[PDB]
Amino acid sequence: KTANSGYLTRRLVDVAQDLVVTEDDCGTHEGIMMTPVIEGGDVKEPLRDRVLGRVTAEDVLKPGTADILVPRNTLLHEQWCDLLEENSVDAVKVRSVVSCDTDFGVCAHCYGRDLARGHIINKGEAIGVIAAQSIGEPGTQLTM
Amino acid sequence: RPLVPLDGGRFATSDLNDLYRRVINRNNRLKRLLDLAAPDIIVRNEKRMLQEAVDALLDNGRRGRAITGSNKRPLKSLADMIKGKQGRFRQNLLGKRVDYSGRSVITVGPYLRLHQCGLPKKMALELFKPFIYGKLELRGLATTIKAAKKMVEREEAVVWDILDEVIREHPVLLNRAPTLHRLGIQAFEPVLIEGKAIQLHPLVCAAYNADFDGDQMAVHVPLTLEAQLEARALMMSTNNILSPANGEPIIVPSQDVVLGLYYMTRDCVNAKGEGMVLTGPKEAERLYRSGLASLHARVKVRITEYEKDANGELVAKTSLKDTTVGRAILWMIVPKGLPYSIVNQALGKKAISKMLNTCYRILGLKPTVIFADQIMYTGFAYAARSGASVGI
Amino acid sequence: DGLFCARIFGPVKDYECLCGKYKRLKHRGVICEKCGVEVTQTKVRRERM
Amino acid sequence: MVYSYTEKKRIRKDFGKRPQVLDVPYLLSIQLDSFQKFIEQDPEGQYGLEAAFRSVFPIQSYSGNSELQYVSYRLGEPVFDVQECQIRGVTYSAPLRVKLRLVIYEREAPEGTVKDIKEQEVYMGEIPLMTDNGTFVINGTERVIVSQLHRSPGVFFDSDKGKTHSSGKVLYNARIIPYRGSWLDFEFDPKDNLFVRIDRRRKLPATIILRALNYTTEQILDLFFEKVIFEIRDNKLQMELVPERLRGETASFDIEANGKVYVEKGRRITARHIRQLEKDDVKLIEVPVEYIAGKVVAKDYIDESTGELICAANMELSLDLLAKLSQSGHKRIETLFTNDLDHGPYISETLRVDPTNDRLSALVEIYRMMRPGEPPTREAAESLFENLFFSEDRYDLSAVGRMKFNRSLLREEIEGSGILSKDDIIDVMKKLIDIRNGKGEVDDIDHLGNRRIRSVGEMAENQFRVGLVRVERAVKERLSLGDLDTLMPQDMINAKPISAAVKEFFGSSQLSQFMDQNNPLSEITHKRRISALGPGGLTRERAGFEVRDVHPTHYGRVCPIETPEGPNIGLINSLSVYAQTNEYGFLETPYRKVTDGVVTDEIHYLSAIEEGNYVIAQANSNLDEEGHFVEDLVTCRSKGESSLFSRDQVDYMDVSTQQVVSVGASLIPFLEHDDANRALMGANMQRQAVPTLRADKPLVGTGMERAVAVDSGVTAVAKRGGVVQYVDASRIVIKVNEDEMYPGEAGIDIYNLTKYTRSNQNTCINQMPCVSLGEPVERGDVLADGPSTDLGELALGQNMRVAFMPWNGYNFEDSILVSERVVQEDRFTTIHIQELACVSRDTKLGPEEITADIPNVGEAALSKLDESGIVYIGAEVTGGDILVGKVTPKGETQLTPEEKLLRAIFGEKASDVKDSSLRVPNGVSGTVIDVQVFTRDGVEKDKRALEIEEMQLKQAKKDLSEELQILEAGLFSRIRAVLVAGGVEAEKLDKLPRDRWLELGLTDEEKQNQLEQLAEQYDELKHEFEKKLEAKRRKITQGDDLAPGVLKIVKVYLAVKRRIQPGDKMAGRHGNKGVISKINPIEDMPYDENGTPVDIVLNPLGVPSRMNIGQILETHLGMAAKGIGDKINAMLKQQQEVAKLREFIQRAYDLGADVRQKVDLSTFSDEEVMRLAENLRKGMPIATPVFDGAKEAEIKELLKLGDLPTSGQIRLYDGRTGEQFERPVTVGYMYMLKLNHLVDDKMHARSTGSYSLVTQQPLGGKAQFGGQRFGEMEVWALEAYGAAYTLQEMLTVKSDDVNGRTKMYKNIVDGNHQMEPGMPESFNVLLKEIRSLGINIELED
Amino acid sequence: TTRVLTEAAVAGKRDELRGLKENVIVGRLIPAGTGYAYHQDRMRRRAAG
DNA sequence: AATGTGCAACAGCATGATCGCGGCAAGCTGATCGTGCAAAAGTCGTGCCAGC
RNA sequence: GCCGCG
Ligand SMILES: [Mg+2]
Ligand SMILES: [Zn+2]
Ligand SMILES: [Zn+2]
């Protein structure tokens, strides 16, 4: 299976090589709606895991109408995640890289914070190779 | 397309030379028979043969099931020998064998810091030859470059001192063979050791997927000012603590460190010392080390915690806590600002990574590095003190 | 006029030309009467086509 | 008697529990037997050289009336024995001398001969021979030849798993594989069409070959189908009744039996109606005309009125043709079954597809298909088809092929023609058809009844046969142009093709590889190896999951544990201990017969096929004294499965408990407590252990160590053991006892031990004697133990006091912490020997001379060189000191005055000649062991040559004079007895020499008969001694006939003692490996209450996640054994009286719960008991067989006897702080090995070196000063970091930028650390390579 | 590579060396990380002339 | 009601199938003739003057 | 081409 893993990671690296963070903020309103990953009778992915270190694309509303909890275009860190877990937020609209609409790259805000360091990502970080390596480092432990 | 040399003065024609010679032969024969008013069929046959030869030269293996020769193996034509595996894999495109590089077996050094590695003095003095030449020439020891080369060859004691000097703040970067992710190549400050095996800090092992059962690592020297700053500020083991795939810390205690931390922070119903009251962790360590109390004994200890509730300020609270001797001893290691509730458990490799994560998210980077080093030290020490063993 | 040639592809050894008519650094870019070899750095054996 | 002399010296405590029926075999039967069958004469041409010779000879010219008749052959005596042959570097081989004669026949008189020239033998070829250990010393190497596992020739049906067309339709294909030739394939098209594939070409309709065998359409339809008859008389149109065939069918109309209704229209189709119809005897009955509409006419009825007829086979019938045949008088019409219930429409479709129906048409079609060139002329197609199949020479499947062919088709006969007939193709086609219908089943291809083993003999025979046919094609030519003067040497003997083919196979082949030399275990494992690769085998990439898996028939034939790890897993295996080969070559395994309910002792060897039907018991089944089974319901294997069966149902029983595991894996004690993968790694790791300075027996063994040590051949084993007469560190001389003696010339046995000698892996091969003096020795005892052997018992490691505990992180992961006492006691110190060679070869400018005087080199370097220019024996060299001084001359003929001044001031050479001397390669050290200078015939002898030759003469005469002295002493004794019988002068007769002038004459009879015969015998003895000594001296001193260019060869040996160090790799035999981390001082290690410190500290965390409980059990058993040894050594220290020592040793040996070992010291006298106790002082070498060894209770009670804690754990005190560790620590004695992976050969570093001519990048690997490869993924990681400048310097300056390298070096030496990058040469090379195509690529601005 | 070069050779296209593998092959600073800053200086000069 | 067109199934062919590292032999194996003549170049046996 | 190492 190591040969298959190596070939897969080669393909991923080559498809994703030409992608670096080039802009501070594209300014788009587009985003991706995120909800806890649920199937059947058990919880699999809580919203805290799926939203941590991402930038909100729209204002999050408490079930009480017309109460702005966290403002638009902000980075969610452990404090924000804990605050939204204290309330009952269930779906959060956070911008993702598939809607950055910038040319030959990705906005530093559409892409969340880099997982290696707590701060938001800096311009010029080659994120395609990092993503390919992260996806391809496992696979040697996937039972095919 | 160099010619293969052989025994004596005889030379062996290589692949492309054979293909070119064949093409030239057929072209010359066709040219000579064109002017002889040869019949149409022989001219046609020679034209076909020339076309076939040119195709075999330009890309062998198709249209004629290869042309082979002298080994019953297809001949390596122009297309096949582009670059290694026909692409740019081997001798281009990130495939270069690099100079100023070495390789050796890795062993465990528990005395190291998080940013240090062990480099043999024989492996150095060979990676750092031009630097040592420069230092010898600049100190006035060897004026001519020949004198410096001879002095390094004879390896006097002054060469060793100068080598120790040039190593001082020059990070060298080690990597393991299957560099799966980016944490598989990291820059450490070398420490010269008398040996032949590279000594690797245990904590980083999980990043490398490296066990000390015959693994080998390669050492590269970043011989430039910009490269040195890049190794120090981008590839240092103190820089990449969290894995850039999920954000969870990747330099975490493993194996013996976890066993030591778990054995230290446990309790038993009856032990030496029960409900005894201690003025602080120092008294707990004194009681354990001198033998008047057990690591698992349950006591009441006066503990002072620090909170960062104020805006960037640490405020202290002192309280009497029901804990064990081992947890109190461990508390002398946690940096100020973390609650005592992170120690009042068993710390089974899930609490310890969580406590490192909270240290990173609350205190910063450098206190977390100091904390990780101290955790590894104390875990090894108390695992050895524990004497845990497997029996039938 | 061979596959390995000295009139083309440049010289074989340093600045020396075949037959040793002009073989030194004093002569440069000169083509011998006997052999069409020119005196140059013989690193052009990797470039002349 | 009960115990041999060598076993009496140290008796292991076997744990047994089950008597062994048959002992382990030779362990080398495969290679020795295969080569013996290949070489030895056979009066029937069954196998070997004689078989090939009878296959080829006799051969005659094309009606030339001249023949070569073959009569027997012979192999000459080898010129050099294996020792000298390995020393010089020549192949160990023997000549072939074949006796053949010419017969020239009469041209005028048919079948008559006119000339018969019977010349002597003619020489061709040089056949290598295998030594007594099963190795071919060729070109001065070892070169074991590995057995091959391939597909036995025959017929194989396959199902391709039924996923080809994604329609779910299963396609069955049959394949005929010859031993030598081209295969046949029959395949099914999902549209249900037969297809035939010859030589794996495109598919063709199958009926072409049937037409090619002179088979008409009617005949093939009759052969491949059964035919029924429809009778239409008086418009009745009756049908024959076949109730068996009418199983599933719908009644289209009323069915009446003899005018009475039997089955209604669409009535019940159950078996009851069929049985009722069959019970009633009913003749043919009328049937509706609608049913016959779908039928197809089989035969071709002929009209009696006109020649026109309906011969269209595979055609249906119309209403008009019914009237036509009625007019023609066709009362009965033959039509095939056309019934699809179990059968089906087949064959007819293929013939409908292809319209050819004539033999010539089929032959021309197949000739065009096979050969797409020129069409034939009735002669090329026929010859081509003859050459494919039913050809005596072009096609041949061997006897195993014919056997498999007959068995697959259930034919009673087994022996048959090794060539295809016309009927077997029909039979295999019908078998494919029937397996399609459902009768029969597809067979497994991995089954060991379908995989054969080719050993050395068969492959050598095949290569010799290839060479032989090649020589025959040549010798056939000349016979038409040869007169009566031609002789066999001139008969185109042509030794060159034969010798070239055999040497090419033996030296450079896929399955003839360097034999590993670490330990005797790795040797013995490599010798008995099964390889699935090879010429006629399969490649690594072309093998799927299924081929490299463990098939249920692998039980007692192929080891399930021992196999390489990464690429070759499952493709390389080792035979089990007991597996052998059939007469055909399939693997068989011993078993014990069961009669009634008892287990008898007769042993039957069962193959893979035969064992499938018998019910086979298990090795560990309890038995009573009478042999019956203790329990009624026992475990068994019936057909590739296992279950519980009754006591009277079984048919065979396992012979022993080592049947499953190989020789390598049967050495791991407590194997049953190890994970299968960890056991695999341990077995593969035992073979890499390096022999140590001193062998140390395993305290915990298995008992197979004696077998490995003895049958590996490294040791010296007696063959006519009597009483040892002389012992030396080099020789052992034994006087054979009188009970066995060859009459005449008396006889003694001399064993010359091989002293320090390099192995293939550059270890040391050393033999030291085991016997002292006057010690009786029996046949089969060991005299000297080779590398890593102790008293004839395999000892490839050392016993180390191992404590399982984490220690300050120094045994993190798998690292191993070692005490300084291990280094101090010189354990794990290994001697490594290296080769260096120098050649004095001729040159255009003159001859190369080896002289001590080397120009330009001073006296200091020449200090270690003698007057001949070669280093002194025992000189310690390192770095680059000169070993031999060789001088290369230079050509100078334009005599110039400056050279005159140079020649005048300095010597006559004036250092004109260059020097090219042998220097130690850098980084190598050692002491010179031996120098092996060889000289050419005619060239003057070197100074050291006379010394070496005189040493050889002195050794030869010293070794040969012993028998001379014995014989002369015997003759003198006989003469003394004779003179005592008459005229005895007592000591005076012994005072004078020559028996005091033969004691005059004395009596007439004694003088004429006794004295004369004694003198005659004495003078004949003197003469034979003189002549044999002269012959030996002439043999030793001669000029070697080396290569034409070379005039002198010099070989220098170096030896260096590598001591253990942190980087070194150490491992136990339970898969637990590691590298050392620290060499702790003695006082820092943990110690027990007795103050004795441990030697090795291991990590316990490596036990539970790896599942090696063999580790812990071996540790406890070693602790118990060392406890008993300590008790014995204590009772020996205080000089305790013998009887109590005997009683204690008896108590130790009488332990265990019903063990089969019954060693009793009552029969032992005092001396042997004292010797044994002194031998058990270090510990009791107790042994546990593989799967039935020591139990928990036995280990605990063994510990109890030695006054050790039964828990196996003691209290350990810290060596640095003195505090007791909180928990008890497991301490014992584990037997550890030092693998060949040392940091001395694995540390490398480079800063500048030599670069490749093209691409100008650094070379690769050590021994060439290479740089580490910055591969693709490394650059990916650097890009992920964002490291642009480091990446740029790694891509241009460090590697490929030609000017960037020099600029960067100058900047560093200056101290600038500036890059100044540039243009990699690799990209310029790529641009030139692309431009050399028809493509223009440039650099724009 | 046979297919990619063939379609590139016919179309007569150019690379412009914008990605990472293009710059690594020719030994230039990659446009990511510490080389990102250097690549921006070159881009503005190209636009300005 | 016979006819032409567009869509789909089956066969053949191209492509690629992890990264480093260490050690050992044997192939690595490799030739276009002669031609017979001027034309040139070189070489050899011989005689020359200049130094001791 | 073979063998092994992680
Ligand atoms: Mg490893
Ligand atoms: Zn964006
Ligand atoms: Zn010239």
Author numbering:
A (entry chain D): 789 to 932
B (entry chain D): 250 to 641
C (entry chain D): 54 to 102
D (entry chain C): 1 to 1341
E (entry chain D): 1328 to 1376
Quote the authors verbatim:
Transcription initiation in bacteria involves the recruitment of RNAP by sigma factors (σ) to promoter regions located upstream from the transcription start site (TSS, position +1). In this study, we used single-particle cryo-electron microscopy (cryoEM) to determine the structures of initial transcribing complexes of increasing RNA lengths from 5 nt to 9 nt, which allow us to propose a mechanism of RNAP promoter escape in the σ54 system.
In RPitc-6nt and RPitc-7nt, the template strand (at −5 and −6 positions) is scrunched around the RII-finger and σ54 ELH, while the nontemplate strand scrunches around the ELH, resulting in poorly defined density. The ELH density becomes significantly poorer at 6 nt compared to that of 5 nt, indicating that there is an increased flexibility of ELH from 6nt.
